[model samples]
Target: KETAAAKFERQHMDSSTSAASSSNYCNQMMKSRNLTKDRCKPVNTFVHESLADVQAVCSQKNVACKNGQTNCYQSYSTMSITACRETGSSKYPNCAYKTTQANKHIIVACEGNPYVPVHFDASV
Candidate 1:
């Protein structure tokens, strides 16, 4: 059987398949602008915790709870960073930062059991 962490990693990685395919359009521009292949790759991280702990971190970060709900059975946060290509290859060309935010869909295997939240952090 696959462990929870393994399942989470596979799902997390698979979610970017669409983006990877779309990146081809700007591949040449990215290369001309000095963006290396490795630098353009995605980066992600995950943290697992109990429901209480997850709430604490969210509260600390000042992230609002969706729908005013105070408790969650399980939760995960994924953050992605994408680089922007400059208009020109000049040294002082302007660049912008783009971010993608998403919350994991909580899956509960057993009913009537307390919700166990898992926290996650991902970036690229």
Candidate 2:
């Protein structure tokens, strides 16, 4: 089983590229990142910042997580992020996504000893 920490890295950690290659980033990355392996993740956000910077959000003030988690935090500054949503035509293996690049403060849930982002709650 993939640990929460590893899963976080797989699902959300992407700071290698400074900017998105194109508008098809969500359609391309959502599949290539293995997020569409079985069923597509309904909604996900990708942060375009260094791991250290992303992790630092956990230090910010707490917020009521979108899914009701107590570990969630909202960033103090706007950050580069991309929102990926499954289009109405999507159906698992038939996955399709709509991508939007936005700069906003984001909320994330953290977990484990290393204190890394575990779940992307929403953009704030």
Candidate 3:
């Protein structure tokens, strides 16, 4: 079974292939990672940092989530990340994406005994 924390990693962590490799980075990643097989994810982010670095965010500054949860934390340091947004004409099983890479502060929701990131909230 896939845990929430693991799913979060599958969806957001990308330590290798750091740059946009090509303009089709999102197109290939979304499908290869099994995110666009059934339904296209409207938007997503991939953090190009080590898993340990991202996990440490659980102990960073606490912030209220969009839904007002207090378990979310904002990273103190900016991280390299890439955003993949679905194209307007994208359809299920054939999703298309537009990629945008940047360095920003990341915010994530953490949970469990180990306090690993269970959800990606936003990038500041």
Candidate 4:
């Protein structure tokens, strides 16, 4: 069984495939990552930074989440991230995604006794 934090890393922290210039990047990833459309889970992000840095967010300064949960923490530096947004058509289970990459600060919600990021809350 996978923990929630591990699942978050598996789904949202792919730092491999660079640039996302090809339309197929998202399609390939969406299929492989099991985020296909119904379970297609929109607005997922892939951080192109070191996984160590990503994990370090648990130690960052606390910020108020949109719902005001103090568990949310924002990164001290801007991170290279690709925001995977699905575009709709009549494609059924084969929907396409528009992958856009940019450097931005990220916010995540950490939980559990070890305090790791369990939720990818927002990026700005």
Candidate 5:
């Protein structure tokens, strides 16, 4: 059974407009750019009741995040997808970082569910 909060979040995150349309746009752009598989990974969909709820999750996850990166253009609530890669550095040599270069993780903001992931792609 879905809780009221879950239902609310779901309704808020549903891609009722631009998100549906952008799917095609993103597909075309990806094809045209010939982006490698490593460059593009699917994001998981998450729905939050408000921006504060979104921020709370990001904070707990320690993901560098911000709100309203998407809604500046569109007139609706938004969703954020973040990916991170580790920078090769000896500063914290023993620690395992995700990517070797900066910009390895990409954060995408959209007015609806991008149907992509919200977590880092830490594959073995």
Candidate 6:
């Protein structure tokens, strides 16, 4: 069974050295990350910060998640991120995406005894 930790890593982590560039960033990354199965993923985000930095959010003060949980925490640092949204005409096996990049403090919901990020909440 795929752990929530693994799924989180697959969906959001992209600590590559190069900055997000090129019109094809999302098209390439979405599939490369295996998020375009069945149908295009409606929306997803890639955090470019190191895994250590991202994980650190789990150790900070807890905050409410966007939906209704108190296990979320906001990162102390403003991080580089890329958001990918499926294009209107995109379909399964022909996934297309529009990429938007920004730097912001991320809020992530966390759980587990080790306290790790499980869901992305918001960016501020």
State which candidate has the highest TM-score: 3
- Runs of candidate 4 with Cα error greater than 4 angstroms are 17-21
| RMSD in order of candidates | 13.2, 1.5, 0.9, 1.9, 16.1, 1.2
Task: Looking at model 5, report the run of 10 residues with the lowest lDDT sum.
Answer: 96-105
lDDT value, residue 63 of candidate 2: 88
Q: Which stretches of candidate 2 lie over 4 Å from their true place?
A: none
Per-residue CA lDDT of candidate 6, range 1-124, in tens?
A: 8888778888989998435887788899999998887778889989998888889989976789988879999988888988899988887888889998889888999989778999988888
Best by lDDT: 3
Name the runs in model 3 displaced over 4 angstroms: none
- Poorest stretch of ten by lDDT in candidate 1: 107-116
Displacement of the residue 8 alpha carbon in candidate 4, Å: 0.9
Models sorted by TM-score, best on top? 3, 6, 2, 4, 1, 5
lDDT of each: 0.32, 0.83, 0.92, 0.80, 0.29, 0.87
Query: Which of candidates 3 and 6 reaches a greater TM-score?
Result: 3
lDDT of 1 by residue, 12-98 (tens): 323322332243323433444344334542332222333333333332333323444433233244222232333333232333222
**How well is each residue in 1-124 modelled by candidate 3, as lDDT tens digits?**
9999989999999998665667799998888778996689999999999999999999999999999999999999999999999999988777899999899999999999998999999999
Candidate 1: how large is its RMSD?
13.2
Task: Give the TM-scores of the predictions, in the order they appear.
Answer: 0.22, 0.89, 0.96, 0.87, 0.19, 0.93
User: 26-80 in candidate 5: lDDT tens per residue?
Assistant: 3332323332234442322323224443423332222222552322221123343
Candidate 5: segments with Cα more than 4 A from true spot: 1-18, 22-53, 58-124
Give the TM-score (vs. native) of candidate 5. Answer: 0.19
TM-score-best of 1 and 3: 3
Q: Compute the lDDT of residue 14 as modeled in candidate 2.
A: 71
- 36-94, model 2: which lDDT tens digit per residue? 98898888888888888888988887888876768999999988888889998889888
